RNA sequence: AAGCUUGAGUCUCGUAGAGGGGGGUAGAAUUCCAGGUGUAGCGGUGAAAUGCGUAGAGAUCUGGAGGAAUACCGGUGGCGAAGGCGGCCCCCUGGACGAAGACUGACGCUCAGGUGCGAAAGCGUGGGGAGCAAACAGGAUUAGAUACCCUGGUAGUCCACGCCGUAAACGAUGUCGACUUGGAGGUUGUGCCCUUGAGGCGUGGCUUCCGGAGCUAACGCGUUAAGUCGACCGCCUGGGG
Ligand SMILES: [Mg+2]
Ligand SMILES: [Mg+2]
Ligand SMILES: [Mg+2]
Ligand SMILES: [Mg+2]
Ligand SMILES: [Mg+2]
Ligand SMILES: [Mg+2]
């Protein structure tokens with residue numbers, strides 16, 4: 001079932017690994033991809049999850065600037 | 072003179088450093104301005120003789 | 127069969143090898159149906175770039191119509207030699223009584 | 227490229243009226259003699275002379291009356307890529323009969339006025355006005 | 356090495372008339388050795404590109420020469436394809 | 444089926460070019476790695492700081508290793524279908540053009556599908572890696588600059604072997620052939636004439652500018668056509684979506 005199940009972390013790690021989108025807990029994102037498994041085309045999974053990172057749920061991407069807060 | 076076959080005789084004009092100087096040491100005629108000062112630029116395409124030895 | 131002109135230099139501190147270097151190189155270009163059109167020696171004059179540790183340099187000028195089957199190994203001979211610094215090969219030049 | 231020797235003859239006549247020259251130089255051919263013979267009886271051209279030994283050479287002489295040109299506008303009907311044929315009772319009248327429609331009948335190259343009254347039908351070359 | 360003296364014996368291989376600087380079977384022999392020397396340069400020096408375009412204006416020339424003498428003399432092609440090894 | 448030459452193929456005799464590719468060589472500059480000499484300053488931003496320094500920095504001389512690009516010469520010059528390519532320079536090799544004479548007698552123009560070429564960026568399998576430079580992070584900065592400034596650097600740029608075939612890939616102009624008042628600047632051949640005033644007077648290719656007739660709404664083009672004819676093909680049928 002790699003078509004759908006090995007194709008969740010290829011999508012999920014990418015967000016939780018990048019230091020720009022790493023402002024999240026692993027379980028929080030483990031959830032938001034099983035939810036959005038059957039939501040956007042099977043060649044556009046991570047691609048349109050970036051819509052939920054910019055059009056929706058954004059500014060939390062890049063984060064609140066802690067390296068300006070402690071500053 | 073007036074021909075263009077005089078390629079093996081430019082040791083009296085240019086120097087080893089790479090700066091072309093006019094014929095003033097010997098003291099000859101300098102009326103040939105286009106056939107010498109201007110005709111030398113046509114041979115800079117193939118540039119068979121090195122113009123700048125320091126480069 | 128074209129026209130060639132090999133202009134190289136020797137070692138500045140080895141001036142006695144000049145008459146012995148051209149002698150051992152004019153025999154291979156003679157029996158291959160080639161002759162020497164011009165043969166003049168300039169001398170150890172002054173330069174304008176002190177690049178070598180020792181700035182003396184004798185220039186060798188000679189014209190010979192060597193075939194292509196011999197210039198492939200003659201040019202690589204000066205690379206292994208330590209006295210020869212550099213060289214200069216032109217193209218399509220005829221002979222002249224003198225150049226300066 | 228050069229795939230129509232008939233269109234080359236009409237180019238020198240059309241462009242020759244604006245340059246105001248005497249005669250032009252062009253190589254002659256079988257059809258070019260029959261075409262120049264029709265325009266010679268007409269006021270279109272004055273006289274032609276073939277004076278080439280190496281090769282036939284056609285020399286056309288234009289006519290200038292007052293300050294106006296004799297040739298008005300020449301079109302093209304029998305195109306090499308598209309040929310147009312008409313019937314004997316369907317001959318087009320150039321300039322309501324005032325023009326000279328050079329046709330190519332079976333007996334030879336003549337005008338459109340002598341084609342419907344004598345001879346047989348033919349192929350319309352162009353519209354010479 | 357394409358010298359002017361090496362191509363003197365190519366014209367003498369095909370001769371129809373006499374004292375002629377040109378025959379009907381010589382238009383292919385003068386262009387066969389030129390393309391054959393450039394075809395072998397594909398295997399080595401693969402970085403070449405300008406040399407590959409130049410063959411398009413020479414290899415395609417032979418396709419027009421086949422339909423020239425086909426409607427005239429068929430026996431003329433029996434010499435060209437077997438001696439210069441053209442199209443087997 | 445049988446011929447000719449006015450479009451010219453090819454070849455002999457010459458010249459011009461960063462046309463393309465494979466080796467080798469030289470110099471300058473940045474930086475790194477070694478001596479001598481010289482020590483609280485150096486790099487850098489209109490103000491500040493981070494980095495780099497008392498384990499010998501910055502700067503200077505000499506020498507060596509590695510990598511990349513060719514200043515003045517260099518003009519909208521030259522070359523190629525386009526893209527693209529500027530160091531002297533060996534080998535291989537192509538295109539175009541000039542020019543007095545032969546031979547072969549339209550082997551000619553163009554095109555769907557297909558093949559090939561196609562900057563930069565990006566990718567796969569292997570190397571190199573001194574600088575610069577997309578993400579990323581140190582220091583400024585402001586009730587938020589991942590816009591700009593400053594200090595570093597992983598891909599990439601370079602090289603061998605492949606894939607993808609994308610641009611304002613513009614000359615916003617498909618190619619070929621023919622006709623058409625002219626002048627004024629460059630580059631590149633062959634001749635005449637007293638080259639004795641290094642020029643006038645002829646014959647070609649390439650390129651730039653101006654301009655009349657003519658063509659087009661207009662700007663302009665205007666003997667390299669976007670003018671006047673002809674052959675072949677492609678694209679586009681309102682603006683968004
Ligand atoms: Mg390539
Ligand atoms: Mg025939
Ligand atoms: Mg080159
Ligand atoms: Mg030191
Ligand atoms: Mg001190
Ligand atoms: Mg230094």
Ligand SMILES: [Mg+2]
Pocket residue numbers: 509573
């Ligand atoms: Mg290194």
Ligand SMILES: [Mg+2]
Pocket residue numbers: none
């Ligand atoms: Mg004769």
Ligand SMILES: [Mg+2]
Pocket residue numbers: none
């Ligand atoms: Mg004949």
Ligand SMILES: [Mg+2]
Pocket residue numbers: 553
């Ligand atoms: Mg074509």
Ligand SMILES: [Mg+2]
Pocket residue numbers: none
């Ligand atoms: Mg690239």
Ligand SMILES: [Mg+2]
Pocket residue numbers: none
């Ligand atoms: Mg590419």
Ligand SMILES: [Mg+2]
Pocket residue numbers: none
């Ligand atoms: Mg790569």
Ligand SMILES: [Mg+2]
Pocket residue numbers: 612
């Ligand atoms: Mg471009």
Ligand SMILES: [Mg+2]
Pocket residue numbers: none
């Ligand atoms: Mg376009």
Ligand SMILES: [Mg+2]
Pocket residue numbers: none
């Ligand atoms: Mg060109």
Ligand SMILES: [Mg+2]
Pocket residue numbers: 665
């Ligand atoms: Mg204009």
Ligand SMILES: [Mg+2]
Pocket residue numbers: 659669
């Ligand atoms: Mg228009």
Ligand SMILES: [Mg+2]
Pocket residue numbers: 681
């Ligand atoms: Mg619409």
Ligand SMILES: [Mg+2]
Pocket residue numbers: none
């Ligand atoms: Mg609509």
